[PDB]
DNA sequence: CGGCATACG
DNA sequence: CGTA
DNA sequence: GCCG
């Protein structure tokens, strides 16, 4: 088992689903305290067992994974034994742990703000709707749409907001493409949002291109919320039979020099490209972001016609977009 | 001991 | 800070 | 929390 999680293969569906949750929960809970590297263990640790095979049955299956120390697998011996981890179980039914889950749900809304809200004595939406002072329009815009915004994004849902996005992107600028990118691009059924990532393939032509998208959206009324500029985190408007439901929509623009290396970031997983970027720096001494992969010794960027190319110029065997999952 | 991804809005 |  |  390589411990990098862009060193092996991660499909969608996997064979440790309730012991891989457990870890998360705990990731997700240490991470509402303020430690970011017990995080990123856990975390680690159970993209670990959906990289398997098979079941993990005995804690015999453990021995020599990476990421895999005392805590979690004592974690997993007990989900073994009784099927139930006391600490996990402490930690999904605290006051703290739900209201933060609560809280950073929210769009707007980070595990820094939860915690003040929190040690203010706020517990529910309804708490924070009562004192608006304290919202950013961010915020405003995020609890004010929040029934919507948790209902899982569909295919469906996926196909139409691509349309639209299409024709403005092509009254905008002519020639001018886009990818979906994110969950969906990974095979994923629902999500959260969705991800589009638009280019040109003529370099430097999409200069100043999210503007002009936004106001075409914005003038055929499919815009709830958005904030020169390269990516917009917006809220759409999209019509349904009938009616309509509020959708999170990501755009960003590249040029098409950067559309590889931004295509490969926004395609994710998180901890996948969180993994490959540390694999980048710490083994191969190259620095990698969405923009590019920087040789910080020549002091020069690789150029880059696919995202095949950036596994190549790392050293690591190519996976697609389904095997990512990490 | 300290690192833990890296950027834009 | 928030977002990705 | 785990690891270089
Ligand atoms: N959520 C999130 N995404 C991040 C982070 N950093 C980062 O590069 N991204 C990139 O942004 C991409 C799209 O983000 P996303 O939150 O829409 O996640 P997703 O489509 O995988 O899942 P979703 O199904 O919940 O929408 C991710 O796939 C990931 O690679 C981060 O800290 N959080
Ligand atoms: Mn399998
Ligand atoms: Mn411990
Ligand atoms: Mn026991
Ligand atoms: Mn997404
Ligand atoms: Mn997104
Ligand atoms: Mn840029
Ligand atoms: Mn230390
Ligand atoms: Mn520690
Ligand atoms: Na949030």
Redesign the pocket.
Known sequence: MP?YACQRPTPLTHHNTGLSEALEILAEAAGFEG????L???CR?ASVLKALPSPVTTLSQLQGL????????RVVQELLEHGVCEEVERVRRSERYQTMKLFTQ?????????DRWYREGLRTLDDLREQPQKLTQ?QKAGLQHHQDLSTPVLRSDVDALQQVVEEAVGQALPGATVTLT?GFRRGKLQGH?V?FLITHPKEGQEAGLLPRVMCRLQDQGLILYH?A???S?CIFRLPQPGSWKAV?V?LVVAPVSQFPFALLG?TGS?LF???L??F???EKGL?????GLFDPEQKTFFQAASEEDIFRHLGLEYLPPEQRNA
């Open positions: 411990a430690s970011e590297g017990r990123l263990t856990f640790a990476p990421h895999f120390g005392e805590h979690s697998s929210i769009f707007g809304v980070g595990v820094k703000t939860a961010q994110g949002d991800d904030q500029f390269e990516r985190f999170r990501d926004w998180k490209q969180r993994e970027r540390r980048s720096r710490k620095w990698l972001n969405s923009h």
